[PDB]
């Protein structure tokens, strides 16, 4: 399956070689001739007056190989002008042997990414719903208005905004492969590429993602403050957390958009080359991931030190649940993320597929895991729910 971006790359190479032919082919035998031209769909050579000119359908089409016997043609008119209709104001061409271009299926993404799409979409759907319910529950009860509950409420808003931004991304990319945007000799998709809407949605996604990871970092730092300090921490730290979880991701996400116009503005900030520019966003995100993991492990050390004597059946339950969250996030997530600094520069393949599988399924279902963990499974929320019911 030939992807859009790969089609653009091949087309650009077609244009390079094509312009080179335009420059190097010798001029025609006589000045009675219409001029060779590249019309962005084919390189037309000079034409004898009153004759047909043929070129193969341009090979950058994803399906050019299915109609190799087809050709596209122009007519060089007898007045030495290219034939054009008084109407279309643009020169006539016949693309019919290559018209399956409008309705063919060859320009599709790799099916494996479509396999991951249903998974992470379902995970952000259930996470979005349960986070909406749980956020309504913690927000709704005046007796539950804890400071830590407001922190978890901010984490819920971060996961929800993340699921929304990923939904708008899936709508945009789904439209990019739709038959309407993939018009015959598609141009409306290019007009969408020039739009601010093409890039602003993806930048908004980048902010929701970096804000989600930084909010997980605020969650880990808050747990370490409640446990290592054992203090009833105040509002100055809370004002700091509000500045951090929405502020820092803005702080390194804005430059990524500035560079995204200054270079790769033709990419609609979707596909990205120049790996350092992509490190501009992911590298701080890798920092938040690794630091949140290290605070996680340190909290595990604190619980290993402080509960050393007590063992009850509830400790057998919740302690095993801590083994579940460790084996899910500590044992696996940080391995793929810390190695990911090397895993996208190289080491692609089925290993890349397993990497996207574990990371996508993880962060997709982590919002549901946080909704059930910080709300529905909380004991005080259960007894308080049974107080009225």
């Amino acid at each position: 399956t030939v992807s859009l971006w790969e089609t653009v790359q091949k087309w650009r190479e077609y244009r390079r070689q094509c312009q080179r032919s335009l420059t190097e082919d010798p001029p025609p035998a006589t000045d009675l001739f219409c001029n060779r031209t590249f019309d962005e769909y084919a390189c037309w050579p000079d034409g004898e007056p009153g004759s047909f000119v043929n070129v193969s359908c341009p090979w950058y089409l994803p399906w050019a190989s299915s109609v190799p016997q087809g050709h596209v043609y122009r007519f060089c008119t007898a007045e030495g002008l290219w034939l054009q209709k008084d109407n279309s104001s643009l020169p006539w061409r016949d693309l019919s042997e290559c018209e399956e271009s409008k309705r063919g299926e060859r320009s599709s993404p790799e099916e494996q990414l479509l396999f991951l799409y249903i998974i992470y979409t379902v995970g952000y759907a259930l996470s979005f719903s349960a986070l909406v319910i749980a956020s309504a529950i913690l927000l709704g009860f005046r007796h539950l208005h804890c400071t830590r509950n407001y922190i978890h409420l901010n984490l819920f808003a971060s996961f929800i905004l993340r699921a929304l931004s990923v939904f708008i991304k899936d709508a945009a990319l789904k439209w990019m492969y739709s038959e309407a945007a993939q018009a015959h000799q598609w141009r409306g998709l290019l007009s969408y590429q020039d739009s601010l809407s093409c890039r602003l949605v993806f930048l908004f996604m980048q902010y929701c993602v970096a804000a989600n990871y930084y909010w997980l970092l605020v969650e880990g730092v808050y747990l370490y403050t409640l446990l290592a300090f054992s203090v009833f921490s105040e509002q100055w730290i809370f004002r700091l957390y509000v500045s951090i979880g929405w502020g820092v991701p803005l702080l390194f996400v804005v430059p990524w958009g500035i560079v995204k116009y200054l270079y790769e503005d033709e990419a609609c900030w979707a596909r990205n080359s120049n790996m350092n520019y992509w490190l501009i966003i992911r590298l701080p995100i890798l920092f938040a991931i690794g630091v949140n993991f290290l605070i996680f492990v340190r909290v595990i050390a604190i619980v290993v030190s402080k509960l050393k004597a007590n063992l009850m059946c509830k400790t057998d339950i919740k302690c095993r649940l801590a083994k579940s969250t460790l084996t899910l996030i500590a044992l696996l997530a940080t391995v793929e993320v810390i190695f990911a600094f090397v895993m996208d520069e190289h080491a692609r393949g089925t290993l890349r597929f397993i990497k996207l599988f574990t990371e996508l399924s993880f962060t997709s279902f982590q919002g549901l895991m946080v909704a059930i963990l910080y709300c529905f499974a909380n004991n005080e929320v259960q007894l308080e729910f049974r107080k009225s019911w």
């Binding site: 992807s3 971006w5 993404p109 790799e110 990414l113 991951l116 990923v166 991304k169 990319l173 993806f202 996604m205 980048q206 993602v209 979707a270 596909r271 990205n272 992509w278 966003i281 992911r282 996208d344 996207l356 996508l360």
Partner: peptide
């Protein structure tokens, strides 16, 4: 999301 979009 950001990485997956590329190959997509």
């Amino acid at each position: 999301x950001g990485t997956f979009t590329s190959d997509x």
